[PDB]
Design a binder for these strands. Structure first.
Length: 1073
RNA sequence: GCUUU
């Protein structure tokens, strides 16, 4: 309950010249007392009288009611920041070394010197793009410093290391003043031109870095990055993190986890000797020298000290540096520069062509319905992003303009213009509009915003391809329900003194122009073989259209902005923006490794234990008939690099016997690591999310980094949430939401009152508040209704429906109309109306919670019923599993040591149910977990009608509606839906093995009847409760269940009527991946 | 205001 106490200290610190705590209660008499108290406080404040007596008088309200919010009457003028800053601004300002970056605009020159005029100005290269200000970030850091000013021992040292660093930020900012933001949290030319261009973004990165510094090492690291970052805006992250790829090969393996036949982690006590040829050491030294030539001193030395022994025990520092480098900010170049960088492929093309054929051979020969109705499938899938151009769209009687894909498809159909048979050109006559992708450390990459003809022509085929990948192990990212641990396990498995692993970064090759000829040609040749496999008109056309998109792309042209002009240049490289992007890139990366591996063997003989492609990297484990020597590693590596070299591929190819390093993960000393470089105070782009969503996303981000090994102080994160979640009532009246409002599992949830522990209402006030928030979950949008009522819109819904189903529509039909009514939310105006409505409703709700006929069941209600029927009891679980993920905080790690871990994702969509599979066999429709959940619970006759309504044949529909499987699906769908409502796949829980025998013993549940739904929920509720206690207490408890038989029947009815909850916290997990 | 997968 410390967030509420913390918020007051912050408000009191921020404003000094009143605060009005607003409470509420589920009890009537208590609430009146709350109402009376709020009134007296306002009146006393409106008379400069002390509220001390009132607090004593309404002691009962403070003691038992629930704090709902805090009123802030501050008559200042959003200043204080300028005044506050000077005391910390005593150090010497930093001076940008305008000689470090190649592209001139990447140097921290004075804004004016880059944009001499207000019309030449652009924040496109420094925009933090986040709904929180620099001024607020400074206030948050200062507030923290004041609080930990009188600390002692080690806590003081943390304050001292931080105070130093903040001085650099302060001193530098003062020399120019604090950049004032506009209503849209953007920094304009007038504020900007006096000050260094990158001043604001750099301040955000430094503040974020310093507020994450605890040890002396963090402080040394933060200081170097902060000082270097101010001048270097293009190679510091790459220079700092580059040595890591060499390092993983160095550390020896002394016992590691592997993957067994059951596809699960299992400890192996083996030893693998790290074998490194002398050349690798020179390469590492060159990397270290480069860091040194760039000003870096402390960071290179740490790697150097580490290099003497190379102990996995002192490897955490190396990992820490790798995670840290990302927090320097994103490299935001100019579209043109990002764009500009861009005989022996016979084997490579053939593999790409062959792989394409295998993935579709079976679907095509049979005459798969999805291939036949591909166009219908493309339409249902269609997003609401960009089609490319801003079109004038007339809806009903409203002439509005949008660039949205969904909008363009409806308008085009309503005017015979909808023509997917014709796949538009993307050459000189019709230049491809451009999208961008910004990442830390790496160079900016471009993205094709192709017209919807392209998505539709490609959506069905890609889906078939993904399915082939789903059951193919080479495709690490798509295989089964697998998570990163299984991939980690697979590399370790075959490691020994007679095998070496070969990892390779091929991010550069994908964007290579050398790559595009063999790529498109390989896919097309494959498409032709597939076409000569059937005579189906639907299959050939869908198949043919896919062939056409590859052909149009072969010679594409792009629209690159060059100031305020749009130069058109002939782009001859494979960029992304296609539906087949990830799958195709995966097929190509795998083909490339196979091609290199085949070429190398002509020389040396080895065995291919495993080959893998995962995103932008690819790797393989080879086995030799003899023991691996340093000389052998060098020979295999030189030959591999040369083979890559002959193909004209600029790639990083390394060889080792113990580790690997790829963009998503890295294995050092038999242990698994994940870069923790998600930036907090700077974003990649500007979306359409709100401050509240942004606050939830930041918290989510804080949690992922903390699990990954980088921890930003929670008090700082809490302070940021208080600023972001606040709402202005006027210019001197600001409202701050309480801890209960923020964390309770509702539609307005932003974070968990306790990290890694999700709570659910177990008190009446919490229930009362939870019900009230839902009451105002979905808000109306006039603009949305208009278009929802327009012809062009209704016809589109109708047209899609008449093409999909045969018999009758409504469970399916109501859904199609909504799905479409939603894709209108991408359209700002509609989104803006919704936010304004939410704010007014929220302001009133915080002021005095309303009523609600409830009558709506949720997950929290089901849990609340079960709680009272369990008897706790101290228990003991010994730690039995060695740590394989070193960075995990201690409380999370302990749960893994005691109950173990998992290498899969729990089915939470219902796809593995027979009914969902049956629908897939005959329909192109895809029901959600929620729809399946309502449908499965329908009367036997209704289910038969729904299946038929979707084109499912009668013998099949009839056979299922009775069978053993239908009864089984019922349990399976609910089980899938419930897991979905409990975030069992997100955050910290995704790690834990919920079917641990050790966990299982702690649950003592006596069967008093036998009714699946109830048995599954009671065990799950118990597992979560036991685990949460372990997460918060470090010890365990055993749970006993004495749930009545009469009670179970009541509960079972309750279970089939659970409503899902939508909230920023929920969106944030979805947002992560 | 722009912002594919």
């Amino acid at each position: 309950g410390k967030y509420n106490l913390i918020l007051s200290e912050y408000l009191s610190f921020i404003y000094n010249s009143v605060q009005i705590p607003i409470y509420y209660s589920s009890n009537s008499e208590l609430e009146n007392r709350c109402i009376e108290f709020h009134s007296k406080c306002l009146e006393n404040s409106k008379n400069g009288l002390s509220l001390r007596k009132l607090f004593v008088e309404y002691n009962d309200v403070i003691e038992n009611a629930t704090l709902l919010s805090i009123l802030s009457y501050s008559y200042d003028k959003y200043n204080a920041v300028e005044r506050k800053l000077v005391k910390y601004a005593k150090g010497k300002p930093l001076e940008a070394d305008l000689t470090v970056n190649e592209l001139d605009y990447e140097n921290n020159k004075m804004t004016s010197e880059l944009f001499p005029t207000a019309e030449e100005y652009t924040d496109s290269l420094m925009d933090p793009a986040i709904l929180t200000s620099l001024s607020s970030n400074l206030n948050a850091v200062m507030f923290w410093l004041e609080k930990h000013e009188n600390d002692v021992a080690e806590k003081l040292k943390v304050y001292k290391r931080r105070l130093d660093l903040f001085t650099i930020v302060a001193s530098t900012i003062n020399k120019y003043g604090v950049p004032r933001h506009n209503a849209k949290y953007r920094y304009e030319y007038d504020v900007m031109k006096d000050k260094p261009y990158y001043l604001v973004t750099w301040a955000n990165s430094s503040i974020e870095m310093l507020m994450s510094v605890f040890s002396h090492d963090d402080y040394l690291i933060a200081k170097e990055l902060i000082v270097l970052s101010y001048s270097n805006r293009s190679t510091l992250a790459k220079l700092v993190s580059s040595p890591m790829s060499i390092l993983v090969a160095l550390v020896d393996i002394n016992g590691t986890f592997i993957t067994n036949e059951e596809l699960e982690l299992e400890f192996s006590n083996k030893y693998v000797r790290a074998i490194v040829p002398d050349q690798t050491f020179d390469e590492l030294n060159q990397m270290l020298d480069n860091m040194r030539k760039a000003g870096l001193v402390d960071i290179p030395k740490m790697i150097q000290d580490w290099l003497v022994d190379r102990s996995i025990e002192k490897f955490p520092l190396m990992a820490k540096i790798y995670s840290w480098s990302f927090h320097v900010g994103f490299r935001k170049q100019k579209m043109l520069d990002a764009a500009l960088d861009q005989e022996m492929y016979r084997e490579y093309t053939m593999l790409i062509r062959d792989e394409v054929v295998k993935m579709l051979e079976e679907p095509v020969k049979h005459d798969d319905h999805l291939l036949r109705d591909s166009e219908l499938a493309g339409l249902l899938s269609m997003s609401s992003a960009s089609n490319g151009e801003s079109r004038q769209l007339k809806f009903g009687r409203k002439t509005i303009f949008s660039t949205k894909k969904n909008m363009h498809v409806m308008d085009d159909m309503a005017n015979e213009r909808y023509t997917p048979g014709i796949i538009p050109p993307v050459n000189v006559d019709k230049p491809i509009p451009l999208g961008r992708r910004d990442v830390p450390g790496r160079r900016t990459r471009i993205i094709f915003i192709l017209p919807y003809e392209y998505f539709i022509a490609q959506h069905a085929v890609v889906e078939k391809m993904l399915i082939y990948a789903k059951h193919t192990r080479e495709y690490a990212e798509f295989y089964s329900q697998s998570n990163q641990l299984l991939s980690y396990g697979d590399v370790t498995r075959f490691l020994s003194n007679n095998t070496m692993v070969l990892y390779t970064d091929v991010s550069q090759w994908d964007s290579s122009q050398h790559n595009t000829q063999p790529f498109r040609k390989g896919i097309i040749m494959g498409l032709d073989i597939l076409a000569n496999m059937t005579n189906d008109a639907k299959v050939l056309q869908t198949l043919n259209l896919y062939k056409q998109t590859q052909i149009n792309l072969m010679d594409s042209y792009v629209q690159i902005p060059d100031g305020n002009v749009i130069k058109k240049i002939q782009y001859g490289a494979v960029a992304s923006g296609e539906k087949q992007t990830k799958a195709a890139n995966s097929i190509a990366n795998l083909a490339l490794i196979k091609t290199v591996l085949s070429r190398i063997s002509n020389k040396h003989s080895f065995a291919t234990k495993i080959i893998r492609v995962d995103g932008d990297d690819n790797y393989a484990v080879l086995q030799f008939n003899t023991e691996v020597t340093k000389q052998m590693i060098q020979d295999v590596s030189n030959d591999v690099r040369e083979t890559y070299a002959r193909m004209n591929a600029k790639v990083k190819a390394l060889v080792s016997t113990v580790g690997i390093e790829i963009a998503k993960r890295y294995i050092a000393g038999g242990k698994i690591f994940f870069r923790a470089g998600i930036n907090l105070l700077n974003n990649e782009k500007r979306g359409q999310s709100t401050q509240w969503d942004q606050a939830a996303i930041l918290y989510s981000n804080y949690i992922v980094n903390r699990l990954r090994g980088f921890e930003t102080d929670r008090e700082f994160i809490l302070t940021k949430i208080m600023q972001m979640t606040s709402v202005a009532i006027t210019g001197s009246l600001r409202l701050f939401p309480s801890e209960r409002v923020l964390t309770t599992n509702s539609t307005f949830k932003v974070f968990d009152s306790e990290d890694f522990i999700i709570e659910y209402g177990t008190t009446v006030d919490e229930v009362y508040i939870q019900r009230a928030f839902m009451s105002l979950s979905s808000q109306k949008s006039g603009i949305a209704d208009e278009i929802a009522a327009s012809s062009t819109f209704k016809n589109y819904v109708t047209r899609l429906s008449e093409q999909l189903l045969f018999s009758k529509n409504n469970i399916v039909s109501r859904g199609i109309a909504l799905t479409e009514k939603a894709k209108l939310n991408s359209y700002a105006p509609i989104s803006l109306e919704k936010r304004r409505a939410q704010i007014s409703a929220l302001l009133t709700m915080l002021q005095k919670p309303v009523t609600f006929k409830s009558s709506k069941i949720t997950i929290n209600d089901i849990l609340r019923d079960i709680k009272p029927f369990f008897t706790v009891s101290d228990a003991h679980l010994p730690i039995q599993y060695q740590k394989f993920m070193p960075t995990l905080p201690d409380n999370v790690q302990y749960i893994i040591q005691c109950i173990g871990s998992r290498t899969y994702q729990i089915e939470d969509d219902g796809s593995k149910s027979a009914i969902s599979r049956l629908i897939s066999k005959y329909s192109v429709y895809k029901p959600s977990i929620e729809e399946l959940y309502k449908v499965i619970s329908l009367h036997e006759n209704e289910i038969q009608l729904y299946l038929i309504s979707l084109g499912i044949p009668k013998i099949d529909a009839d056979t299922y509606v009775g069978s053993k499987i239908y009864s089984r699906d019922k349990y399976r769908i609910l089980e899938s839906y419930v897991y979905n409502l409990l975030s069992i796949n997100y955050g910290c829980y995704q790690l834990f093995d919920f079917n641990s025998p050790d966990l299982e013993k702690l649950i003592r549940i006596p069967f008093k009847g036998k009714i699946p739904a109830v048995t599954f929920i009671l065990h799950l509720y118990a597992k979560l409760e036991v685990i949460n206690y372990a997460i918060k207490n470090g010890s365990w408890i055993s749970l006993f269940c004495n749930y009545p038989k009469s009670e179970m029947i009541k509960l079972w009815k309750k279970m089939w009527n659970i409503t899902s909850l939508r909230s920023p916290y929920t969106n944030a997990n979805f947002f992560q991946e």
